C-alpha cells in the first residue's frame, strides 16, 4: 500500500486581541482584529474606562478553512471536512471544486450552550477521499487556538474600567483593564528544578524513600510521563516513582547502562526497556515490595539473545513471553494498548495478547533505497537507521521514530512521511539536525528534539504540527561543559527556557498538563519546562507585575484584584474593596481618592461616587449592557448597539460628534464614519496571511496590512503602495522592527527581579542603522538587595555601549533614593513621601534643598528652593484658590459658577468662561475685551474659531480627525495657508496665495526627500541625504542671481552623536569641526576649537588665551560670567537674584581699566520690570495699562515721558510722535514711512519705505525660516543653518557686499561667545545672561565695540557703528534699519516693546495654567531674566541627548521653530495610524523613562452645538 501521497490543508486562525492605543485619546481604530478601542473619563479622577469589542458577544472567532489552490489531483473528488471543538462537532461534506473554501464562524460557545473562557484549542480534521482506493481516506489533523469570551472584569455592561484587573488563573491570561490581554500561557516557558542538586550520591542509597527536593542523585538517564503525573526516573539502578506530592519512593533494582522507560496512558503500569538484561519488564508493586530485584515481571526476551538479522523470527508468531530478543531500546504503547518496542534495529509489535508481530521491520534488501525526501513509501519496504526512541501522538495515532536525526512519522495509512529533519541524502524538514539523542511529543502534536553535542549546544528545538522548528529550551552556551568540567553549566535557575543553560539533556517526557521534564546529567537535576504560571507567595497571592506602568499587582485566591503596588518602591497605591460576590465597588488611592461605585441587586452599577463627591448616573439596555453615562445636567456620552450583538454601533459625545460604526456577522469593524464626513473602508479577507485594507475616504493612502502569524513570532506587515513596515513581535515581547528606512531596532526581554518569570521587561535596546557605525547599545542592570522577606535596596544602572552612566540605587530603609555616578561628581538624594511622592531633593556641592510637600487631596502644596518658595490652597475639587509667593505677592483664583476670575494684588480681573471639560469658551480682560471662541464640525475638518473683540477677522485652525493641522487663515485680509497630504500621512504641499512648498518622500527609505518652495522666479529647493533616518548631507540650491548655494557634510562615531561638521558655502569649503564628547557622563569635552572643563557646577569654556568662565549660584542658575583675555581682566558681570529668581543687581565692569557700570532692577508687586537704575541714578520707568499695555516709558537716550495709546484689541497705535498700524488681522501694517508686507504664515516678507526711501525684502524658505535679507541701501545678507540638534540656531551668515562668511559658535546654554569670519578673521564675544552681545573683542583683546543696552535692548551707547552684528537682543536676529528683532517665528519690536505677530497656540498654553498674559507680551514683561522641575541632569552637566537617542534635548532658547519644521526632523515616529505602532510607542516611552480636565486631539476651544446635531451621521466618501 504505497503511492498515495498525503493531503495539503491550508488553515488560518484569527489573530489575538493584544493591540490597543497607548495614550487612548488619539486613535480609536486598530485594524489588527478590527477591534474598536474607546476611552472615556470619570470626572475628578484620571481613572478612565475602556471599550474593547473583543469582549462583545458578536465578536465571533473565524477559522478560515480553504482546501485547494485548484491543484486537486485527478483521483480525488470528495471532501469529508470535520471540526472538533470543546464539544461542538461540525461536519460538512463537499464535492471537490477548484478553489473551494469554507469559513467556520465559531460562536465561542460549547454545544451545551456554555460560555467558554480563556484559551481553547479546537482540532481541525481535514479529510479527503480517493477514487483509487475508496475505502482508504485521508486524515491530516491540526490544531488552532481560538479566543473564548474574555472574563467579565467589573460588569460595566460590557465596558471595562481602566486600572481594574482580572486574572484567568485557569487558562493563564491576565485580562488588563486598559485594553491589554497579557496571555501568561503564551509566554516563553519556565524552568523549575524539582529534584536535587548537582552533587552525587553512592550506590547503596540511604534515605531512599522519603521526599526528594534536595535529594542527591546518581545518574538520571531516563524519564517517563504518566496519567497520574508520576515521573518515573531512571537513576542508573533505581526506578523512582515521584508522586504528585512531596514523597518519592523507589521501585526497581538493577549505553547499555542507559535503559529507557515507557508509560501506558490507559493503565497505570510501568514499562522498562532494559537493554543490558535483554528483557522487557513490568513491576508488581509501584509503592514497593520487599526486594527491588524480584519486583519485575518479564514480558519478552528471556535474557537470551536472538538472531541478528534473519527475516524468519527471533521467536515471532508464537508467544511474546517465550521469544528472545537482541539489544532492546526505547519504546511506547498505543492508546489501543499495543506496545511497540525497538529491538535490534527495527520496530517490533506486540498486541493485547502475548504475540510478537511486525508492522515495519528491517533487512529488506529489495528496498535498500535512499531516504525518500518528498513523499511516502511502502509499509514493508523501508530501511531503518538507529531508531533508539519512540513517542506517539494520540491525536492521529501517529508513530514518531527517531531515524538518524530525522523523525520519520508512521500514521494509520501504513505510510512513512518525513515529519521533521532532513538527512545527508538531501521549515523543520528543510533544516538538518545534530546529536538528536531523545524525542517526545505532547498532546497537541508538538515534537521535542533535544540536541546535545555537549560542546556549546545543549538545547531542545521543538517541531510543531506544521513541520517548522523553533528553539524553545536550551540557550546556546559559550562555555564548554566537556573539557571545562569545572565550569558552572548551571545558570539562571527559575529563569526563562530560552535563557536557561543546559548540560547534556538525556530524556524527555510530556505530561498531560504540558510540563516537559528534562533529565540533565551535567548538573544532576530534573528541570521542568512547564507552562507559565502566575506565582503564589507565602501569603497565597498572585504577584503579577508589568513595568509598562512600573507596577506590581497582587491578587486574591480566585485571582481578582486587591491592591496595586508601585514596583520600584514597594509602597502601596490602591485599595479595592468588594461586594460579597467579589465584584469591585470602591477604590482608595494613597491620598484617599475614593472612586466608589454601588450596584444593583442584579450586580449592575447605577451611580458612580467620585472622590470630589460627584455622582455619575448610568443606565442599562435591553441586552443587559450600558447605553449612556450621565452626570449632573448634561448627558456626557451616548452609546447604542446592533441589537443583541454587544457591538458598539453609535458613539455620541456631549456635543454632537455622533460617529456610526458598521460590522459584519463575524465581528469586524469595516466602516467608521466621522461626522466631519471622512469615513473609512476596511476590506477584511483571509489568505496565506490575514489581510486588511483600510481606505481613508479623504486621502488615497490605502494601507495593505498582512499578518504572517508563525509559531516563532507574529511578523506583521504595513504597506503603503511602496513603503513596507513590518514588526517582529515575540511571545515574550521581543520587539524588533523592519522600517523601510533601513532602521532595524530590536528590543529584548528580561524577567523582573522582584516579579519573576511571569513578567517580560525591556532592559536592552539594540538598534541598527543601514551603515557602518549604526550600532547603539543601551542597557539596564536590575538588582535588588534582599533582606528578610522584603526588598531593601533596589538598584538599577543605565549603560550605553559598555559603561555606566547613572547609578539609580533606590533604598527602602528610610524610603530615600540616591541617584549618582561612580565618579563622585553627581549626587542627588531624594527623600520620598509615605504616599509614594518625591518630597525633598538634596543635591550637593553648593546647591539648595528643595522640599516639596503635597496636598491632602493628592496634588502639590508648596515648592521651596531654600528662600524662593510659593504656597497654594485648594477646594474640594482640587482647584487652586490662592497662589501666594515668597516675595509677598499673592494671586486669587476667585472662581464663579463654572468660570474663573483671576485677581492679582493690583485688581486685574481675568474672566474666563469654561466648558464641562474645562476648555476655553470666552476670555474677558480687565477691560471689556471679550475673546469669544468656538469649535465647530464642518465638511471634512474641524474649525477652531477665535474671535477678537468687535471683529469678523477670525483666525481659524483646521484639523483632521487624527489631529494634523490643515488650514490656518487670517480672515481680515482673507489670506490663508493650505496643506496637502501625500501617501505617508504627513505634510507635503504648503499653499498660500503664490507659494507652493512641495515636499516629497523617498520610495525605498521613506525619509524627507525634497523641500522645494516655488513662489516666483525665485526657486527655493532643499534636498537631504541620510544614514537611515539621521541626516548626513543637506543641499541648498537656489536659482536667482545674487543668492548662493550651500551644502553640508556630517560624520558619526558609534552613536547618534554629530561628530564632525564640514560644509561648503558658495563653492568655499570650511575647516572641519571637532565635537569631542564625553560618553562616560554625557558631557561635552570640546567643540569647534574651544575646550570645556567642568568644576562641579561650573564651566570654563577656555582656549590657550581666551577664557570664558561661569560661576553658577546656589540655586542652579547663572550668577557670575567672568571673562579674561591674555589672563587679564576684560569683562565680568555679577547677577544676584531676589526671592523670585529675577535679576536684581548687575555690576557690568566692561572694559579693561575703564569705569565700572552697574544696575538695579526695581520690580513691582505685579512682577515686572517697572523702573531701572543706572549706577547712581534712576534712569528708566515703565507704566502699564489695564491689559498689560506699556503706555508710558523713558526712551533710549532722552529723558522724556513718551506716551503710548492702545485700542480694544491691545493693538499698538502710537509711540510718542510716530503712529503705528497693527491692522484688522493683527499684522503690523505701517510704522511711520515704513509699510510692511507680512505673509500668510504670519511672517514678515517685504518692508518698503515711502518717505525715507529704502526697501528691505526677506526671502524665506518653505520651513518658515529666514534665508536672505536684502536692503536697498546695499546690505545684502543670506543665512545658512548648519545645526540639526538645534535646527533654528543659525551658524553661518553670507554677506553679498563683501563676499565673506561669518561662522558662529555658541556656548553650552546657547549664548553667543565667538565669531570667526571665513575670510580669515576672529572675534571673542562676551555675552550676558539674556544671550545678547555686549562686548566685541579681537584676538588681541582690544575692545572693538561696546554696547550698553536698555531694559528692552535697544542701543543708547555705541563705540563703533560700522561693525554691526546680525544677532542682537536675546539672541534673535537684529536689524538696525527695520528696528525689528526677528526671533524664530515672531518678530519683536525694540521701539514698541511688544510683539508684532499675535500668537495662536498661546491659548493652548494658557488654557492649562492661567497667568498674567497678553497677546503681545514679551517674556511676561520680565526682559532680563531666564530660568520648577527641581532637579535636572543638565545642571550637573549630564547632557544625555548625545548618549541616549530618542531623548528630548533641553530647549534653552526663545527662538521657536515652525510647525512644518517640527515635522521635518520627525523622521518616521508619526502620530500613530495602526495598532502595532501603538505597542512600539509604549516600549520606547517606558524604556526612555528615567525618573519615577484632560484633553483631546487638538480640540482647543469649547464645543459648539453645531448644525450636525446629536444623533445624525454625515458622511463623505471621496
Ligand atoms: C472565591 O474564593 C472563595 C474561597 O477563596 C470561594 O469559596 C468562591 O467560590 C470563589 N468564587 C467566588 C465567585 O466568590
Ligand atoms: C462599508 O462601506 C462601503 C462603502 O461605503 C459599503 O459598500 C459597505 O456596504 C459598507 N458595509 C457596511 C457593513 O456598512
Ligand atoms: C544587535 O543587532 C545586530 C544586527 O541587528 C547584531 O549584529 C548585534 O550582534 C546585536 N547586538 C546585541 C548586543 O544584541
Ligand atoms: C523644608 O526643610 C526645612 C529644613 O530643610 C524644614 O525646616 C521645613 O519644615 C521643610 N518643609 C517642608 C514643607 O518639608
Ligand atoms: C557686510 O559687508 C559690508 C561691507 O562694508 C560691511 O559694512 C558689513 O558690516 C558686513 N555685514 C556683516 C554682517 O558682516
Residue numbers in the entry: 965 to 1218, 1229 to 1400, 1412 to 2412, 2421 to 2485, 2497 to 2522
Q: What's written in the study?
A:
Teneurins have recently emerged as vital specificity-determining cell–cell adhesion receptors. The Teneurin extracellular region defines its adhesive specificity and controls both homophilic and heterophilic trans interactions across the synapse. Here we present X-ray and electron microscopy (EM) structures for two out of four Teneurin (Ten2 and 3) ectodomains, revealing a ~200 kDa super-fold with a 170 kDa rigid core. Eight sub-domains, of which five were previously unreported, form an intricate structure centred on a spiraling YD-repeat shell domain.
The structures were solved by X-ray crystallography (Ten2CT) and single-particle cryo-EM (Ten3CT) to 2.4 and 3.8 Å resolution, respectively. Both FN and plug are also resolved in Ten3CT. In support of this hypothesis, both the ABD and the Tox-GHH are mobile and not resolved in the cryo-EM structure of Ten3CT. The residues downstream of the Rhs-associated core (residues 2467–2592 in Ten2CT and 2382–2508 in Ten3CT) are located within the shell itself. Our own structural data support a model of NHL-NHL mediated trans interactions involving, at least in part, an alternatively spliced loop of the NHL domain.
